[PDB]
Nucleic acid binder design. Structure first.
Lengths: 98, 83, 847, 104, 95, 97, 87, 105, 94
DNA sequence: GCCTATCGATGTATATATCTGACACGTGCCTGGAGACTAGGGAGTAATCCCCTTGGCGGTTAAAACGCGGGGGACAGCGCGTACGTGCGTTTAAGCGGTGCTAGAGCTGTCTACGACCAATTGAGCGGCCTCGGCACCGGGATTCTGAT
DNA sequence: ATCAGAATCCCGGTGCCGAGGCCGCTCAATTGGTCGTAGACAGCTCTAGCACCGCTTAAACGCACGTACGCGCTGTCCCCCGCGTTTTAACCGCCAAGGGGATTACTCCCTAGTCTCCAGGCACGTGTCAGATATATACATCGATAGGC
C-alpha cells in the first residue's frame, strides 16, 4: 500500500532537474516552433542547426528564470501552487509587461 | 508544408520539467497556457530581430550570429555559440 | 622722607600706577619747588604721563600741605577724558568735576556747580575757560594746572590775561614743546608761572639773551641754571622709558610619533616632485601645507582622530606642539598672564577651541570671519572679563585693534609678508601699554618649521630691521625655480634625526629658564640673554637679534640628510620594483595591490635650455603686451559706443541737467607759496571753528550774503516722507520735483550735486538761497545702502568750495547723525572745515 | 622580440593593437593601452579559471566544462554582477529549494 | 582553405598557469574566448565614450584604468588594475 | 469636532501629488546628505546645484516607480498595507540586490 | 551649549513624511512603519553607486567640480536616463 | 536653395548630421544618403512627439508646452512608454492612477 | 561667448507646423534636444555594429533603416521608415 | 438593518482678480555648409565550389497521453487587538533672501614627444590532421531514504 | 516508535572519438624611419559655487486613541500530484538532393578629401504678455447627521 505523499516526490523531481544540466524541452517540437514563428515574418526560411539550439537554450533559461520569479510570488502570497496571476505580477514588475 | 500547434508540443510535461528545475512544487493547470503565450511573445521578438539581421546580411539562412546579435540587442547573451 | 616717599603719595591716595623712575623724579621736583614756593613747568615730552605726575602733585598738596583746594585743570578735550579717567582711577580721593558741553549743557552745569560746591579738581577746556572766565573766577582757587600750556605762548592771548586775572598762588604748566622756536613762549609761561620772579616785561631780555644758545655753551649753562627750579624736561628710554620694553622669544618643541607617522607617509607619497624639477612648484607648495598641518596637529587630517571622536588627552599626545602649549598654558594661567594666539590656519583654531573646552579655559576668538560689531564685543569682553586666551587668525588681527590688556603674544606659524606680523604687533604693544610685553614664535626643533624659519627668519628679521632702520636690504626675490630647490633643501633637512627616532621626541622643558623672570605676572624686560662673559681670550659669537637660546638660523640641510633622502627615494623605488617584479597575484589569495597609474598622476618635462627659457620669457611678455594693448583699445571702443547710447538717451527725454560736473582736475590756486601753517592767534576760538546751532536746517541764519544749503540724497529721485525731508517740503515743493525729474531722467551720477534755489515759499529778506543735493547713495532690490558714499562726500565738498568761493556765498550744513549716539561725525566735519572754514568761507552747522 | 614577450604577456600585443585600430574606438591609440587591456583581460580570465579549475576538481573531472563555468560565475558575486544577463550553454541552474516548500 | 584566428592558445597557456595539470573541453574554450572578446568591447566602448565626453582624440592608459574601474565592479577592477598597471610598467620599462 | 475616516485623506493625498508636478523631498536635507556621503568618497569635491537637482529628480523617480511596484505586490498578497517584504520582492524581481 | 550640538544623520532628513509623501504619489494607501528605514537603505545604496560613478568621471576629467553631465553619464550607463538637465 | 535639407524638404540639418556621423567614428566612411534618412527620421519622431505635446498643452487649456505635458503624452503613447520605458523626465510627474482595491465603497 | 548648437530651432519650427499658436518652455526644449541626441546615439551605435558585422567601411541609408527597424516600436517604425524613404527619394532627385 | 436622504464641513474647481519673468522676437556677426575640384579602393561586381541544411527512410524506444484517487493546500470565515490613520499641538529649520570670496574653470599658443604612416621582413600561429584515455556508459554493485511500524 | 521496502548512490570495467599535439605558409608583429599635431602644458582671465548671516512659516516632531486592517486559527473540499497505465512519434541511425553560403576574382562610383566661400545659426540683445499669483468664491463630496421604516 506504500505511496509517496503529494509533493514529496515532486521535491525529488526538483532535485533531479536541478542537478541535471541537459535540456528539458522536446527538441523536434521546439524546432517546429522556431520554424512556425519565423513563418510569420518570411516564408521558406532556412535555419542553422546551431541557431535553433541557441534559441532553445535561450528560451529555456528565460522560462526557468520566470518560473523562479513565479515561485517566489506564489510563496509571497503564502501559496505553493503557481498561477498565471503570479506570472502577470512578475512580468509587470520586471517591466516586460511594461 | 505549413506549421501549426507545436506550441502545445511544449506540452504540460515539458512545462512541468521546466517548473521542477525552477523549484516549483505545485503547478496550476492555468499556467500551461500562460507559459505558451509568454514564450511565443519572447520568441517572436528574438526571431524578429534575428530575421532583421539576416536580411541585413542579405542571407536566406538564419545563423547563430543573428541569434547572438538579437540577444545582445535585447541585452541578453549566450556564450558557447558563434564566435 | 626718601623722595617724598612713593608710599606717602600712595598713602595720600595714589592708586593704579607706579611712579616710574621718570614719574617719581618729576613729582618730587614739583614737591621740592613747592617747598621753595617757585611755580613750575613740566616740559617733559608727550606720553610720559604728565597727567599722572600732576595728579600726584595734587595728592602731595592735599596729603602733606593739607591744601584742600579747589584746583583748576585746563586741558584739550581729547585729553580731558583722559584727565577725568586718571583722576577717578588714580586719585579717587580728590573729587574731579567736568565743566564741558554745549551752551545749554554749560548752563545746567553752572547751576549744578553752584548747588554742589564741593569739588577738589575742576576739568575744563581752553575754549570754555575763555567763554566762562567770569564763571570760573567765582571760585577761590588754590593751584592752577595747564595741560599742554603752549596755548599761553603769547602773553597777549585772552587765555593768558584771564588766568592772570584768576587768584593764583602756585602754578603748574605742562607742555610738550616749551619752546616752539620762540623764547617768548617759554618766558610767557615763566611769567605766568611765577610773575614775581619773571615779570611780564622781561620778555625782550629773555629772548635776546638766550637766542643763540646753539652757538653759546655758556648761555646754555646759564639758562638751565635759572630754569632748573621752574622747567623740568627729560629724554626717552634711558630713564623716561614711556613704553614697556618689548621682549622676543623663540620656542623649540618636540614631535610625537603620530606626527612622525604622517611625516613619513606624506613625504614618501609624492617623491616625484624631487625627480621632476619643474613639477616642484605646485606639488611642494601643497606638501608644505600638509607638513605645517602635521606639525600643528595630525587631526587636521581626515580620519586621524580615533573614532569615537571623544574629547581627551590623546589630543596633546598627538601633537608635540600642543603638548608643549598645554603645559605652557597651565604655567601662564598660574602666572595670570594673558595670551594672544596668531595662526594662519583657522582649522587649528577650531581644535584649540575644542581644547579650551576640554581644559575649561576662558577664551575669545577673532579671525577674518568675526564681523566688526561682533569684533567690538569680543574686544570689550576681553577688556572687561577675565579672558585668559584670545584666538586670532594672523591676517585678520593686524587691522586697527587694540589689545594692550594682554602681555603674551604667540605666533603659531609665520606669514609670507613680515609686514603683517609687525602690523599685528602694533595692536597690543601700542602706545599706552603699561606692562612689559613678551613676543613668542613657535618652532619644532629640527622640524620643517625650523628650516622654513631659518630662511624665512633671515628675510623677516632683515625686513623688520629694514622698517625701523630704513635701509631696505630686502633679500632678493629668487625666481620659483630656486624656490623649488629651496623647498627640496628644506625637504632634505633633518631627515637623519627625523626618521631615526620614530618615537615621540617630546621633551619636558623647564619653561621658566627660557622665559625669564615673572614679577606680579609681568615679564621682566631683560635684553635677549647674551650667554654671560667669562673673561679669558675674547671670542665673538653673535648674541644678536637673530639668536635665541644661542641658536643661529639661516643654515642649510646637512649633506647627510640630503643623502638619506636620495637613498629613501631609491628604497621606495625598490619596493615598487619588487612588487612589480613579482609574479601573478590572485584575489582568493588576497595579494597586495599597487595603487593607480604612475603617470596617471602628471610628470613635468625637461627645462628648455636657459637660453630657450629666456626667449620664451620674452615671447610670453611680448604676446601679453601686444594683446593687452590691442584688446584694451577695442574695449575702449565699446565704451565709446555706450557713450553714444547715454547721450542719445538723455537727448531723447528733453531733460535739462541740474547736476554739477565732477570737478576733480582743477589746480587749487590758493596763493602758491609753501603751504606753511598760518599761525592762528588765540583770539576767540569761535571765529574759525564750525558754529553749531540748534534749529531747522532749511532756514539758514545768513544775514545779507547768499546762502548755500547742503544735503545728501540717493539716485532714485523718490522723495522721502518724515523728518528732515518733511522740513524741506515745508520750505519748498520744488526740491522734490527736480529730484524726481533728475532720478527718472538718469541725471544722478555718484558725486553729482543738484543746485537750485530755495526762495520758492519762504525767502530771506536779503540774499539768495540755493540748495545743493549730493548724489551719494544707490538702492538695489536687496536694499543695502553704503555709508553715504564716503567718496561722494569728498567730491561734493570739493565742488562746494569752488562754487561757494566763486559765488562768495555762505555754506550751511546739518550736523549729520547728531541724534545717533556714537555716530562718526569727525570725517564729515574735517572735510567741511578743511575745505571751507580754514579757507575763509563762512560755514554754519544746524542740528 | 615580441612586444608581448616584452610585456610579459600571454596575450598578443600586435593582435590586440590591431583590434583596437579596427574597432574605430578613437582617432589615436597609445602603445601601452593595449598592454593594460590585454593584461586585464588576461587577469580576469585566469581568476575565473582557477575557480573553474576548482569546480572541475571538486566534480572529480580533469577537464573543465560549461557546467563548471555556470557554477563558478554565480559564486563570484562580482562575476554574477558583471555577467547578470549572460547565459552559458549547458550551464544548468544553481541547486536551491525554498524552506517553505521543504517537508515538515 | 579559409583562415580563422582565435585567442584559445593563450587560454590554454593560462590554463596551465592556474592548473598546469588541468585540461579543458572545446565548449568551455569557446565560452571563454567569447567572454574575453565581449569584455574587450565593453572596455573599449567606455574608453571611447569617455574620450568623446572629453573631446579627446587619443585613448591611453588613463582611459584604460578608469574604464576598467567602472566596468569591473568595484573591487574587481582593483585587482585587475594592479596587474594592468604593472604590465604596462613592464612594457614601458622595457624597450 | 470633525475627523476624516482612515484612508479618506490618503486618497486625497495620492490624487494631489499625482496631479502635482512638484518635487517631494526637501532640497537642503537632500543636498547635505549628498555632501556628507561625498565625505565617504573624497576629502574635497565641489558640486553644481543643477547636478544635485538632477540627482533628486532621478532619486524621486526611482523610488516612486518602486512604490508603484510595491503597491502591486501588496495587492497581489491581498493586502492594502505595504511592507518591507514587498519592497524586497519587487527589487528581487527587478533583478536588484 | 551652542559651541557644538549632536545632530541626527541627514538620511533621517528624508523624513517619515517625505517617504510617506513619495509613497502616496506611488499610489500607496497604507504603510507599515518598518518601511522608513528600509527605504532609506535602498536609497542610500542607490545613491552610493551613482555618486561613486560620478566621482569616477570627474576625477578622470581631473576636475574638482562635479558636473550634471557626469550625473547624466552615470544615469545613462546605469540605464536610467534623465531628460531635462543637459545633452 | 543651397541647403540639402530644403532639397529633401526637411527642417532638420543634414549637413550637421553628416558632420556628426563622420566625427562619431561610427564607420570609416559615411554615405550622403544616410544623413538624409536619419534627419528625416529624427524630424518625424520630433513631429510625432510634438503633436502629442501640443495636444496635451492645448487640452490643458494652455498655449505653452511644459514637461508635465510631455510625461502625460509619452506614457499615453503606449509605444513611447516602452521605447522610453526606463527614461525619466524632469518635472514630468506621474499619471493619476489608483488601484480598485484601494478605492472606497 | 563660446558658440554652442542645438536642435532647438528645428524643434520650434516643427512645433509651429503640428500646432500653430502655441509655444514651448525652455525645460521642454531641453528635453526634446536631449531626446534627439539620445536616439541619434542609439541609431549610430547599432549602425556601427552592423557595419562591422558586415565588415563595411561605408554607412548607408540601408544601415539606418535596419537600425530603425530594430529600435522602433511596431507601428512607429512604419511611419518613420516611410518618412526616411520619402526624404531620400525626394532629395536624390536633386 | 437599513437607504434616503440631510446639514454643513471641509474642502475643491471656478469665477474674475492682478503681476512678471520667461517667453518671445531680432542683431550683428561668423563659421562651418555648401559648391565647387579630384582620386582610387570599397561595395558592388559576378562566378563558383562544394558545402549545410533540408529532404528522407523506418526503427525502437522513451515518452507523452490519459485517469483514478485523495489529503493536503487552496480557499474562504472569523475574531483578535495591535498599529497605523487621523487631527491635535510644538517646535525646528527649509526656504527665500541676502553678503563676501577666490578656486578653478576656462581659453590660447607653441611646439615635441607619441603616436601616425610606411616599409621590410620572420616567424607566431596558422589548417589540417593524428593518437591516446578521460570520459561516457553500461551493468550492476551498495546505501539510504519514506511512510508504513 | 522502528523498520521494511521503494529508490536512491557507488563502483568496476569498457571503448569511443575528442583533446591535445603534430607540422605549414602567410601574412602580419615586430623591427626600422619622419612628421606633426595634440595635448599638454603654461599661461592669463572671470566666473559660480561656496561660507556666512538673516527672518520667516511651514513641517516635521510629537500628541493621542480609534479604527480596521492584518493577524492566527478556524473550517472546507476538491486538484495537482503519485502511480498506474496507455500510447506516442522523438530520437536516432542511415542515406542523399541542391539551395545556397561563402569562396573566388573584378570595376567603377562614391565618398573623402580637395579649396573657396557666404548665409543660416547663433549669442547677445531687447522687450511683453500668458501664465503666476490674487481672493474669494460657488459648489461638491465627506463627516456625522439622522432619521424614520
Amino acid at each position: 500500500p506504500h505511496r509517496y505523499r503529494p509533493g514529496t516526490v515532486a521535491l525529488r523531481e526538483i532535485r533531479r532537474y536541478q542537478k541535471s544540466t541537459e535540456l528539458l524541452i522536446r527538441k523536434l517540437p521546439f524546432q517546429r516552433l522556431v520554424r512556425e514563428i519565423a513563418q510569420d515574418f518570411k516564408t521558406d526560411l532556412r535555419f542553422q542547426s546551431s541557431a535553433v539550439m541557441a534559441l532553445q537554450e535561450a528560451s529555456e533559461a528565460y522560462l526557468v528564470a520566470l518560473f523562479e520569479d513565479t515561485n517566489l510570488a506564489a510563496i509571497h502570497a503564502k501559496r505553493v501552487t503557481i498561477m498565471p496571476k503570479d506570472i502577470q505580477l512578475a512580468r509587470r514588475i520586471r517591466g516586460e509587461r511594461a | 508544408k505549413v506549421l501549426r500547434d507545436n506550441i502545445q508540443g511544449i506540452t504540460k510535461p515539458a512545462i512541468r520539467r521546466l517548473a521542477r528545475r525552477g523549484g516549483v512544487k505545485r503547478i496550476s493547470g492555468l499556467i500551461y497556457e500562460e507559459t505558451r503565450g509568454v514564450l511565443k511573445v519572447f520568441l517572436e521578438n528574438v526571431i524578429r530581430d534575428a530575421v532583421t539581421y539576416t536580411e541585413h546580411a542579405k542571407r536566406k539562412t538564419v545563423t547563430a550570429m543573428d541569434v547572438v546579435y538579437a540577444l545582445k540587442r535585447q541585452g541578453r547573451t549566450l556564450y558557447g555559440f558563434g564566435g | 622722607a626718601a623722595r617724598v616717599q612713593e608710599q606717602d603719595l600712595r598713602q595720600w591716595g595714589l592708586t593704579g600706577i607706579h611712579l616710574r623712575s621718570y614719574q617719581l623724579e618729576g613729582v618730587n621736583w614739583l614737591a621740592q619747588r613747592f617747598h621753595c614756593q617757585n611755580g613750575c613747568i613740566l616740559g617733559d615730552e608727550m606720553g610720559l604721563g604728565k597727567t599722572c605726575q600732576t595728579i600726584a602733585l595734587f595728592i602731595y598738596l592735599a596729603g602733606r600741605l593739607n591744601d584742600e583746594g579747589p584746583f583748576l585743570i585746563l586741558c584739550p578735550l581729547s585729553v580731558l577724558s583722559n584727565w577725568k579717567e586718571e583722576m577717578q582711577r588714580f586719585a579717587p580721593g580728590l573729587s574731579c568735576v567736568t565743566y564741558a558741553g554745549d551752551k545749554e549743557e554749560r548752563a545746567c552745569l553752572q547751576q549744578d556747580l553752584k548747588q554742589e560746591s564741593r569739588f577738589h579738581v575742576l576739568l575744563t577746556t581752553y575754549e570754555i575757560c575763555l567763554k566762562d572766565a567770569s564763571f570760573l573766577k567765582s571760585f577761590p582757587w588754590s593751584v592752577l594746572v595747564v595741560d599742554e600750556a603752549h596755548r599761553l605762548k603769547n602773553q597777549s592771548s585772552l587765555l593768558h590775561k584771564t588766568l592772570s586775572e584768576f587768584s593764583v598762588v602756585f602754578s603748574l604748566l605742562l607742555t610738550g614743546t616749551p619752546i616752539q622756536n620762540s623764547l617768548q613762549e617759554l618766558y610767557s609761561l615763566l611769567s605766568f608761572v611765577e610773575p614775581d620772579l619773571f615779570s611780564k616785561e622781561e620778555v625782550g631780555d629773555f629772548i635776546q639773551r638766550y637766542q643763540d644758545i646753539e652757538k653759546e655753551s655758556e648761555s646754555a649753562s646759564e639758562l638751565h641754571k635759572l630754569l632748573q627750579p621752574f622747567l623740568l624736561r627729560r629724554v626717552k628710554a634711558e630713564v623716561a622709558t614711556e613704553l614697556p620694553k618689548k621682549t622676543e622669544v623663540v620656542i623649540y618643541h618636540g614631535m610625537s610619533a603620530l606626527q612622525k607617522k604622517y611625516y613619513k607617509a606624506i613625504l614618501m607619497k609624492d617623491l616625484d616632485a624631487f625627480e621632476n624639477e619643474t613639477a616642484k612648484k605646485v606639488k611642494l607648495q601643497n606638501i608644505l601645507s600638509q607638513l605645517r598641518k602635521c606639525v600643528d596637529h595630525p587631526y587636521l587630517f581626515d580620519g586621524v582622530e580615533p573614532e569615537p571622536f571623544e574629547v581627551g588627552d590623546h589630543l596633546t599626545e598627538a601633537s608635540g606642539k600642543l603638548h608643549l602649549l598645554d603645559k605652557l598654558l597651565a604655567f601662564l594661567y598660574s602666572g595670570g598672564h594673558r595670551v594672544l594666539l596668531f595662526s594662519q590656519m583657522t582649522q587649528m583654531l577650531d581644535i584649540l577651541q575644542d581644547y579650551m573646552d576640554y581644559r575649561g579655559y576662558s577664551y575669545e576668538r577673532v579671525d577674518g570671519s568675526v564681523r566688526g560689531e561682533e569684533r567690538h564685543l569680543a574686544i570689550k569682553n576681553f577688556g572687561q572679563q577675565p579672558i585668559f586666551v584670545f584666538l586670532l587668525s594672523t591676517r585678520a588681527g593686524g587691522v586697527g585693534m587694540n589689545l594692550t590688556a594682554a602681555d603674551t603674544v604667540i605666533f603659531v606659524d609665520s606669514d609670507f609678508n613680515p609686514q603683517n606680523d609687525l602690523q599685528a604687533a602694533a595692536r597690543a604693544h601700542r602706545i599706552g601699554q603699561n606692562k612689559s610685553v613678551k613676543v613668542i614664535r613657535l618652532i619644532g626643533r629640527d622640524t620643517v618649521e625650523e628650516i622654513v624659519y631659518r630662511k624665512a627668519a633671515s628675510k623677516l628679521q632683515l625686513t623688520n630691521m629694514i622698517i625701523e632702520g630704513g635701509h631696505f636690504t630686502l633679500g632678493a626675490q629668487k625666481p620659483a625655480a630656486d624656490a623649488d630647490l629651496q623647498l627640496s633643501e628644506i625637504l632634505k633637512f633633518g631627515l637623519d634625526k627625523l626618521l631615526a627616532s620614530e618615537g615621540s621626541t617630546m621633551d619636558e622643558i623647564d619653561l621658566e629658564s627660557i622665559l625669564g623672570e615673572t614679577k606680579d605676572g609681568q615679564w621682566v624686560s631683560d635684553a635677549l640673554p647674551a650667554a654671560e662673559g667669562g673673561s679669558r681670550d675674547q671670542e665673538e659669537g653673535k648674541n644678536h637679534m637673530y639668536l635665541f637660546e644661542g641658536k643661529d638660523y639661516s643654515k642649510e640641510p646637512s649633506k647627510e640628510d640630503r643623502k638619506s633622502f636620495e637613498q629613501l627615494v631609491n628604497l621606495q623605488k625598490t619596493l615598487l620594483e619588487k612588487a612589480s617584479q613579482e609574479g601573478r597575484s590572485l584575489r582568493n589569495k588576497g595579494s597586495v595591490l599597487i595603487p593607480g597609474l604612475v603617470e596617471g598622476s602628471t610628470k613635468r618635462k625637461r627645462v628648455l635650455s636657459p637660453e630657450e627659457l629666456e626667449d620664451r620669457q620674452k615671447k610670453r611678455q611680448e604676446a601679453a603686451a601686444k594683446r593687452r594693448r590691442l584688446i584694451e583699445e577695442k574695449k575702449r571702443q565699446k565704451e565709446e559706443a555706450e557713450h553714444k547710447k547715454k547721450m542719445a538717451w538723455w537727448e531723447s527725454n528733453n531733460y535739462q541737467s541740474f547736476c554739477l560736473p565732477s570737478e576733480e582736475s582743477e589746480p587749487e590756486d590758493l596763493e602758491n607759496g609753501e603751504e606753511s601753517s598760518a599761525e592762528l592767534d588765540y583770539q576767540d576760538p569761535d571765529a574759525t571753528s564750525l558754529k553749531y546751532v540748534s534749529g531747522d536746517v532749511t532756514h539758514p541764519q545768513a544775514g545779507a550774503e547768499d546762502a548755500l544749503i547742503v544735503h545728501c540724497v540717493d539716485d532714485s529721485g523718490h522723495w522721502g516722507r518724515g523728518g528732515l525731508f518733511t522740513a524741506l517740503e515745508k520750505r519748498s515743493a520744488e526740491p522734490r520735483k527736480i529730484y524726481e525729474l533728475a532720478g527718472k531722467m538718469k541725471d544722478l551720477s555718484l558725486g553729482g550735486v543738484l543746485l537750485f534755489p530755495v526762495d520758492d515759499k519762504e525767502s530771506r529778506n536779503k540774499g539768495q538761497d540755493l540748495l545743493a543735493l549730493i548724489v551719494a547713495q544707490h538702492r538695489d532690490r536687496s536694499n543695502v545702502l553704503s555709508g553715504i558714499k564716503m567718496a561722494a562726500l569728498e567730491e561734493g565738498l570739493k565742488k562746494i568750495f569752488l562754487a561757494a568761493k566763486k559765488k562768495k556765498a555762505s555754506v550751511h550744513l546739518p550736523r549729520i547723525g547728531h541724534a545717533t549716539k556714537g555716530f562718526n561725525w569727525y570725517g564729515t566735519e574735517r572735510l567741511i572745515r578743511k575745505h571751507l572754514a580754514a579757507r575763509g568761507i563762512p560755514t554754519y552747522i544746524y542740528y | 622580440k615580441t612586444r608581448s614577450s616584452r610585456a610579459g604577456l600571454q596575450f598578443p600585443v600586435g593582435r590586440v593593437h590591431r583590434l583596437l585600430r579596427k574597432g574605430n574606438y578613437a582617432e589615436r591609440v597609445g602603445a601601452g593601452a593595449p598592454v593594460y587591456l590585454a593584461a586585464v583581460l588576461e587577469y580576469l580570465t585566469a581568476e575565473i579559471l582557477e575557480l573553474a579549475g576548482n569546480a572541475a576538481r571538486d566534480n572529480k573531472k580533469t577537464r573543465i566544462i560549461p557546467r563548471h563555468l555556470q557554477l563558478a560565475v554565480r559564486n563570484d558575486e562580482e562575476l554574477n554582477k558583471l555577467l547578470g544577463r549572460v547565459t552559458i550553454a549547458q550551464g544548468g541552474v544553481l541547486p536551491n529549494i525554498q524552506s517553505v516548500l521543504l517537508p515538515k | 582553405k579559409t583562415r580563422k584566428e582565435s585567442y584559445a592558445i593563450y587560454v590554454y597557456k593560462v590554463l596551465k598557469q592556474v592548473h598546469p595539470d588541468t585540461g579543458i573541453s572545446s565548449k568551455a574554450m569557446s565560452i571563454m574566448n567569447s567572454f574575453v572578446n565581449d569584455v574587450f568591447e565593453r572596455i573599449a566602448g567606455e574608453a571611447s565614450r569617455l574620450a568623446h565626453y572629453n573631446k579627446r582624440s587619443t585613448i591611453t592608459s588613463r582611459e584604460i584604468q578608469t574604464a576598467v574601474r567602472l566596468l569591473l565592479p568595484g573591487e574587481l577592477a582593483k585587482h585587475a588594475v594592479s596587474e594592468g598597471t604593472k604590465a604596462v610598467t613592464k612594457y614601458t620599462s622595457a624597450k
